[PDB]
Amino acid sequence: LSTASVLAFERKLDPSDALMSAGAWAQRDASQEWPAVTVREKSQTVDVANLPSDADTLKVRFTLRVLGGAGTPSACNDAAYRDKLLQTVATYVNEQGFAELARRYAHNLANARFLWRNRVGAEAVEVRINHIRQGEVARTWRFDALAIGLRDFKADAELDALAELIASGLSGSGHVLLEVVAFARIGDGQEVFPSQELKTLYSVRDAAAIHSQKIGNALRTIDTWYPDEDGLGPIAVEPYGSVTSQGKAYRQPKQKLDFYTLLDNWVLRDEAPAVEQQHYVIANLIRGGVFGE
Amino acid sequence: MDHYLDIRLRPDPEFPPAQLMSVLFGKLHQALVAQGGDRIGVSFPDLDESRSRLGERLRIHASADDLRALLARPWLEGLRDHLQFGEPAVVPHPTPYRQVSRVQAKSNPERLRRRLMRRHDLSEEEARKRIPDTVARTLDLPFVTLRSQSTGQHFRLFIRHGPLQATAEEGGFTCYGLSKGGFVPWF
Numbered sequence: 001l002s003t004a005s006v007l008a009f010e011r012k013l014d015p016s017d018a019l020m021s022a023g024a025w026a027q028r029d030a031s032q033e034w035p036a037v038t039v040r041e042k043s044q045t046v047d048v049a050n051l052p053s054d055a056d057t058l059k060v061r062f063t064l065r066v067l068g069g070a071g072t073p074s075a076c077n078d079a080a081y082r083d084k085l086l087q088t089v090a091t092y093v094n095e096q097g098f099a100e101l102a103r104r105y106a107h108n109l110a111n112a113r114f115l116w117r118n119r120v121g122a123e124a125v126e127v128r129i130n131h132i133r134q135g136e137v138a139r140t141w142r143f144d145a146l147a148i149g150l151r152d153f154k155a156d157a158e159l160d161a162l163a164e165l166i167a168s169g170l171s172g173s174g175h176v177l178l179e180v181v182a183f184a185r186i187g188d189g190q191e192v193f194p195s196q197e198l199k200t201l202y203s204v205r206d207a208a209a210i211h212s213q214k215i216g217n218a219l220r221t222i223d224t225w226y227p228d229e230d231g232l233g234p235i236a237v238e239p240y241g242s243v244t245s246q247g248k249a250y251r252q253p254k255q256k257l258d259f260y261t262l263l264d265n266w267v268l269r270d271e272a273p274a275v276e277q278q279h280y281v282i283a284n285l286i287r288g289g290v291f292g293e
Numbered sequence: 294m295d296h297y298l299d300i301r302l303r304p305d306p307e308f309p310p311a312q313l314m315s316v317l318f319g320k321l322h323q324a325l326v327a328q329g330g331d332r333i334g335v336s337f338p339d340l341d342e343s344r345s346r347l348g349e350r351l352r353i354h355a356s357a358d359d360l361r362a363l364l365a366r367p368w369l370e371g372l373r374d375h376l377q378f379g380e381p382a383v384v385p386h387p388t389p390y391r392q393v394s395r396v397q398a399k400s401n402p403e404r405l406r407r408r409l410m411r412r413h414d415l416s417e418e419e420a421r422k423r424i425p426d427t428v429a430r431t432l433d434l435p436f437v438t439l440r441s442q443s444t445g446q447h448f449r450l451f452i453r454h455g456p457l458q459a460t461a462e463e464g465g466f467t468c469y470g471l472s473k474g475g476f477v478p479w480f
Contacts, residue, residue: 050445116307121316121371150374191445221307235306243306 001268004078004292011288012070012170013105015215018062018114020194020208022055028126028183031059036207037192046199049208050191058118058184058192062215064109066169066176070286085267092282093171100279101286102167104222104234107153109162112145112182114210114218117193119145124185131165132177139165145182151233153224170286220287225276226250227257237283239291259284260291294334294354294477298363299379302349310349311438313375317351318450318469319439324368325468333359335393335470336477337435340454347435347452353470354477357381388480392455392472398430454479 023034037058039049051058071089076082108114112125119125125146131139141158148154169176186192195202195211202209223235228250235241235250239259242249251258256265262281265271272278302310302317325333333355339348353360360381399405405428406420415423434451441447450469457479464474 048445119371120308120375121320123367123370146371187442189445190442191440232304232306245306245309246304 001080001084002078003264003268004076004081006075006077007073007292008075008290009070009285009288010074011216012067012286013216013219014065014067015212015219016062016064017204017212018060018210018215019204020049020192020210021059021061022051023057023059024055025057025124025183025185028057028059028128031181031183034059037194038206039194039201039203039208047201048191049194049201050189051186053189056185056187056190058115058186059181060115060118060184060210061179061181062114062210062212064176064178064180064219066166066178068170068172070170070282081267088267089282089285092278096275098167098170099163101222101283102170103160103163104153105219106159106163106166107148108219108221109178109180110143110145110156110159111148111150112184113150113221114180114215115182115184116210116214116218118184118186122146122184122186126183128181128183129162130179130181132179220283222283223280225280227255237280237287239284239289263291294332294356294475295383296355296357296360296381297336297384297478298353298360298381299338300351300353301377301379302351303374303376304349305375311347314347314349314351315438317372317376318437320368320372321351321353322439322469324363324366325470327366327368328359328363330359331465331467331473332356332475333470334466334472334475334477336391336479337393337452337454338480340435342454345433345435347437352477354384384478385480388478389457389459390461390476391457391479392453392476393470394453394455395467395469395471396432396434396451396453398432400429400431402426402428 020037021034022037023031037049037051039047041047071086073082109129110127112119112127127143127145129141130137141162165176168174192208194208195214202211217236220237221234223237223241224230226235226241235243240249240253241251253261257277259281262273262277266273302313305313336352336354337347337350338352339350341348402424405424409415409420409423432451434453436449436451438447438449458476461476462474464472466473466475
């Protein structure tokens, strides 16, 4: 028994492209006709997006689909390896649920980390999260995203209810669609930070926006078990868990704590790692990607 | 100035430290605009003039009441997850002194063209022959990248630390913290 030559997992937790709009504070519950942030050009010619001079609140909106079935690959050569991996994820699920992982994902949903440079320097940010069962709303969460810190994973009753909903979605016990709206208080005429293309800015049709993979990278920023340090905080879950900014790679394969060696020890040789590393590798299986030769 | 405060940039995966020092210097400029005064200076004790780096430290010099005031203001709201604080204490003895100067250049010829054609009513060619394209000055100084609020423009500001002296003299400071005659203790 060895690993399969092709192996591919579809991503779970599909985010949408986060659209940007602008308005004034305390119109936050009337934020349905708010005009969108228009990208304009100015003098080298650079495209920048600013809030209008009568608006201090940037509203970003996206949707998130929690689907489930995180253990089954989308493509696999070997059948015995596939059955071994499926029963391994089955014993992981029977040991503990998705509760730690959904708790961390609900934390990253709670704080407005998906606002990357639009969160820094904001005086007040607020997150509204609607679980939408039918065509209408079924549950609402309201969070002060400045209260949830970017370093620690706390506990809160509304946050635990949100995490229970996300863990129910990840277990395949129900279909989860969330709508995430976030309000940021920056000021009048200030600039916003949408994603940049290959200087030009990312735009859905006459509206500034963020890439969906950017929101997805922010949402899986849960990895707090890398053996180099922990005082920096969480990072995004990656095989050879690295960051593009620092230019350095944690989970180096010289150390026995990357994703691939952990998966080969757990599935083939039945050397089950520590439970935080089990959380890490299951988070990578939720993240998806191309594994194998 | 008797009292110094060291704020350290927390090492961050989500942004490089140049961007955090950019936004920290910008909110420092906005806070010094909001307080006014000219007896408030800055220094960067993690200098490295070989690779022209600004390091990870920011040392603000003033009195005791100014620093204990600047702790409790909303210029630290929204940033305190991304940086660590120190304690406002006395500068030890003995220390040298040096300056923090803003050193720009006329590295854009086109602004000099606009100046020479707006004051003299020249042509494009007379302005081109008067000042050539070799006027662009190169700099090996560390820089901070800030933007503007009302009429928004993003620019790099070069910081130059002057020569180490043995005594300091009187002098003011701008809203950027830069030296206008007053020197900061280097340690």
